[PDB]
């Protein structure tokens, strides 16, 4: 792995310091339907004319990004994404900007959110949950080795490709950091104590988020929830948890080691690294190289209703994509 990782660090850095920009134009894409929405902008299922391929295009309004004080995060997530490369990470195929917005055209993952599937099925068996955890454990091992902290792990942020494999794609809260950072960001249920308590936190949080994910996947509901954030934060800082009776002892002991309020005790954060996790009884069954290789059989496989079928997808108000006749926020995004 170290051998693999050191060769990737090298790949990462080359792109990280000499990124890429203006790899395509908007005139060469046919918008199909909105798939996501928010303060950032909006992700859209698109079709490449000359090729006919389907891509997920994220459109950001420049003036708005400025207004909301999001120019650093906006350049950071696009910088991180054109530089990472892992089997479970969504590649960014193209990226340009015009007199109005910034565009990030990624690989379209058609199986949608793991969230949709989890709320429908109820809960996930441990082997099914584990299948996914395994893919997350690897993607953090990687990301972390590049001194990148993820901090935005949650079902709604995890997609399932056609082979039934997990795909991470949103790097808005990602931070290039070797030591500690302080910002408060994430989703209440996935926040680690230390992020709540206004403490300097490291990459260990991403490991807390995993124990949470593995818990919500096997149980169907998060380890700490409540009516409002504040009461959750409260639940969390107590690090007091109860497990569904069906949970295996092994799945329980792994979670007691992941959801550990004592940082000096958190797995993936101890002295032996991720191997404390990779080597946990719960993962005995896991074939780490086959998972990497994608040689393992998904326990669930979306069966698309054709290329770019978006029927099992919620709808959104389609807004026109306007582009100003005059430049907008030039200087602030010259790095895009």
């Amino acid at each position: 792995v170290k051998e693999f990782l050191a060769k990737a660090k090298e790949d990462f850095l080359k792109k990280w310091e000499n990124p890429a920009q203006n790899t395509a134009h908007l005139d060469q894409f046919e918008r199909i339907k909105t798939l996501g929405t928010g303060s950032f902008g909006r992700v859209m299922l698109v079709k490449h004319m000359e090729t006919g391929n389907h891509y997920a295009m994220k459109i950001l309004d420049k003036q708005k990004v400025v207004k909301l004080k999001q120019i650093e995060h906006t350049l950071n997530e696009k910088r991180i994404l054109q530089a990472v490369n892992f089997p479970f990470l969504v590649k960014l195929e193209f990226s340009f900007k015009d007199n109005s917005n910034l565009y990030m055209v990624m690989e379209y993952v058609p199986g949608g959110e793991m969230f949709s599937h989890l709320r429908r099925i109820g809960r996930f068996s441990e082997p099914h949950a584990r299948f996914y955890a395994a893919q997350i454990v690897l993607t953090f091992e990687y990301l972390h080795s590049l001194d990148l902290i993820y901090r935005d792990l949650k079902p709604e942020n995890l997609l399932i490709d056609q082979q039934g494999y997990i795909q991470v794609t949103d790097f808005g809260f990602a931070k290039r950091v070797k030591g500690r950072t302080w910002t408060l960001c994430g989703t209440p249920e996935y926040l680690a104590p230390e992020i709540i308590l206004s403490k300097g936190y490291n990459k260990a949080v991403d490991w807390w988020a995993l124990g949470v994910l593995i818990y919500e996947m096997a149980a169907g509901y998060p380890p700490f929830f409540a009516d409002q954030p504040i009461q959750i934060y409260e639940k969390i800082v107590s690090g007091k948890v109860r497990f569904p009776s069906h949970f295996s002892s092994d799945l329980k002991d792994l979670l007691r080691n992941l959801l550990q309020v004592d940082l000096t005790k958190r797995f993936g954060n101890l002295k032996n690294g991720v191997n404390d996790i990779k080597n946990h009884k719960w993962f005995a069954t896991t074939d780490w190289i086959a998972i990497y290789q994608r040689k393992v059989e998904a326990p669930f496989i979306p069966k698309f209703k054709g290329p770019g079928d978006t029927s099992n997808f919620d709808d959104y108000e389609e807004e026109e994509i306007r582009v100003s006749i005059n430049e907008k926020c030039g200087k602030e995004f010259s790095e895009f």
Partner: peptide
Amino acid sequence: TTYADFIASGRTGRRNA
């Protein structure tokens, strides 16, 4: 029950950051 409390919490849909 926990599943029961979960529903009552109202945080059973997509959560924002």
